[PDB]
Amino acid sequence: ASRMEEVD
Amino acid sequence: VQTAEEIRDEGNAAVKDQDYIKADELYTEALQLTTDEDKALRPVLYRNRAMARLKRDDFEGAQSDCTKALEFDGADVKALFRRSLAREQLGNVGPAFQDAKEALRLSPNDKGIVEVLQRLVKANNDKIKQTTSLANKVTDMEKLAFRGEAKDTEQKMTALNNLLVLCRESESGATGVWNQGALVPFVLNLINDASENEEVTVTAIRILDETIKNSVRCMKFLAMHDPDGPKSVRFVCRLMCKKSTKDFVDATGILVQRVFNAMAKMDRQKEMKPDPEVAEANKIWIIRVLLELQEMLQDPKVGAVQRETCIDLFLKNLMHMDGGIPRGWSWKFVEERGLLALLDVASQIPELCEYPVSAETRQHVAICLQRLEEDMVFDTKRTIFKEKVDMFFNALISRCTNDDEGHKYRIKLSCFLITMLQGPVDIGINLITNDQLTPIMLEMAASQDHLMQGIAAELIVATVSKHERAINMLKVGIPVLRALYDSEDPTVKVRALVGLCKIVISLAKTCKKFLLETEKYSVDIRRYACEGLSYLSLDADVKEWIVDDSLLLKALVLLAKKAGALCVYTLATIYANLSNAFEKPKFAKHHVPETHPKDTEEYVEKRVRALVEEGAVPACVAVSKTESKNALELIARSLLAFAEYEDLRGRIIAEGGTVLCLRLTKEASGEGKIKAGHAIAKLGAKADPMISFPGQRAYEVVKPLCDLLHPDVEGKANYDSLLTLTNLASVSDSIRGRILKEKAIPKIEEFWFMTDHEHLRAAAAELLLNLLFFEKFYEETVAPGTDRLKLWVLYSAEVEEERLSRASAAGFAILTEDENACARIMDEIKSWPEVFKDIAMHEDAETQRRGLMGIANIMHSSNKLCSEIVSSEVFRVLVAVTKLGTINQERAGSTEQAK
């Protein structure tokens, strides 16, 4: 559960 | 080494630091390291880079990376999400939705995907019925513009103009005007018509222009003019020849610019380094453009303007260390025929040339050659570079016989040096310290070939340098000059005065007689007349002398208003020095040299005031068209130091000030950009934002004075940037819109948390009042839960000064119009009564009026607050007798709220 606007 | 891995994280952090520019680069840089042996490590990178790009509005890039990710794992929900958000922006809502859709059913719950689909829905809904509306706006204009279904010039011009307007207007406005490539022909038709006005063509070109910023549209434009790729590239590059007018050639060179941009995913005006991946791919096209542009460097059929443009074309796209093409190109340029041909152009003046050239053609070859050498970086290369120029310096020299024919080869070998000395000077210097050049020098110096005579003085004058090591060919050279000076041929006296000038007042006495004699002597003569006068201006006495004579300023203006870029490095330096625009790193003595009352105190104004009364600015604009660097930096310092006398800015504004400095920002180099800004920030403040930054001028005037506050660790013109930014956010919301998005306020806020800066806070005050003077940032300062409100109330109160009140107070009333507001205060503002009471009858007029009107509407909406009459009710009464003031209105206002 990681809302978008965040990179991996 | 730097592992493929860790470099990536180095990027993800860059994202988190909010500097997406580095992330983009870092990720691509990261990608480089890994290839097709790390498989998986790639897709993740593309999936990432895309967020970055997406954040720097590189939609076409974001899109590319996403699909590049899915190529691997079609499930990559992160890919499909961004690729949609990309397409969504590209006005391509269609498969945009079906991506943000199929994305959702892969992660059913995600406030994110959802917030998009909602938007993409009201999208496909208005889709069709909306496109066909533009299709008609298009056609109707297309009808009056190209298809000649219009009568009278103006009418046709506005169609074209609107077409251009709608063209950049949005992402669709472009695609619309492009009309599937039907725009190209229509434009080529205007280029091809001998009789159509330049302004028409120019405009029509600028329309076709924007439509090809799109990598795909552009690349289809480059290859669409012949079934044979190479030939098709020729056609495009050659368009600039179709006509000779300045504006035409220019507006067309850009089309070629676009081609480079699109060919290697890069834009210098966006700090978008190229993406090696793309560039590598379609190299076959880079090659051909380079080659075709190279070949016309010497093509005699190719004019002078195009010639100079074709040079700048390399100076902006080949130099990998200057936002140009990726590393590896410039090297193959010198390792083949690129440099040699670029070199052949160095040794070419009008008087003796094998293919059209103009006075200006020199600069364009200098800088380009300078930067070409700078773009060599490695050792093995700086070698093949000098090693080549060397070979060229031989072949040339060893043909400088002593006959009318061989004399030419001396004029070549000569200019080939004056050039190489204003450019990669170091490679130049190391060429003349071969006293095999001093004889030829002397020879021609003594000859009776007026040309050879003159361009010899110019060869040592252009050797004056600074230090020694070459003071050799100056040992004899300098004296040589002294003799050549007597000459009765103007062109040889003047060309000689310089150098003998750049090394007492008698020299200055002369440079004047040349310049004032406007009609008589010629242009290229007075060019050096200026250049000389230039070096002289560094001395105070000369400084004051000059500005003292009107005519010299009146004519020195007429000189730029006719020569342009030929008199820049020089004319700037005259105005730079004449206005003291350079800087210095701020028993015993020397408080005397600081004298020269003409270089000190109020003398600067005696000159600055005078220069301005005699053009000064209109001249700066006239010679500011140079892909220089420092030259701009001088017009900068020169304009910065021009606007600092109040009633002065009230004119320089009207002499194209704003427009120029604006350019200076993007264009100018290093500290140049910086200076430009301050100049603007200082031009606008005690002046109306309307009568200065009209027609969307106001938008670009922001990024600058927002990047200049960043360095807020103290100093600068932060206060000047604010009084304008404030006076800027006043009228229009698109303004405040940008000011916000700029990530600027998290900083301007700090011009509020200050103590002894009574001024640098009265600014942030009056600003933040007009900054929230309408949505977006109005509801951002009320709900969230940021202590903000506290001061807007505390400031109308903390009055011992003033303004900080009337401001944060006028922002007390107009802010209270919100209910949820009175909610965060009355329950968190422990001690509000004292504060309220302070502002209650506070003695600062307007503050007890804006203060009361601020409190009078806190109890006028919400009873749990109106009930709080503790000592408040007092004032309201008192203020109702004979104060004569109007504070009785905001006072008798607290009243009605009791029924």
Curated annotation (Swiss-Prot), chain A:
Which domain of life does the UniProt lineage start with? Eukaryota
Quote the tissue specificity entry: In the embryo comma stage, expression is strongly detected in cells of the head region and less so in other areas. In early larvae, expressed in postembryonic germ cells derived from Z2 and Z3 cells and the head region, in both hermaphrodites and males. Under heat stress conditions, larval expression is not only detected in germ cells, but also all over the body. In adult hermaphrodites, expression is localized uniquely in the germ cells.
Spell out the subcellular localization from the entry.
Cytoplasm, Perinuclear region
Q: Per the entry, what induces it? A: Induced by heat-stress.
What positions does the record give for the motif labelled TPR repeat-binding? 4-8
State the domain notes: The TPR repeat-binding motif mediates interaction with TPR repeat-containing proteins.
Partners and quaternary state? Homodimer. Interacts (via TPR repeat-binding and central region) with pph-5 (via phosphatase domain); the interaction promotes pph-5 phosphatase activity. Interacts (via central region) with co-chaperone cdc-37 (via N-terminus); the interaction inhibits daf-21 ATPase activity.
Q: What does this protein do?
A: Molecular chaperone that promotes the maturation, structural maintenance and proper regulation of specific target proteins involved for instance in cell cycle control and signal transduction. Undergoes a functional cycle that is linked to its ATPase activity. This cycle probably induces conformational changes in the client proteins, thereby causing their activation. Interacts dynamically with various co-chaperones that modulate its substrate recognition, ATPase cycle and chaperone function.
Family to which the UniProt record says this protein belongs:
Belongs to the heat shock protein 90 family.
Name the UniProt record assigns to this protein: Heat shock protein 90
User: Which species is listed as the source?
Assistant: Caenorhabditis elegans
Lineage summary: Eukaryota, Metazoa, Ecdysozoa, Nematoda, Chromadorea
Name of the gene: hsp-90
- Which residues of the complete protein does this chain represent? 695 to 702 of 702
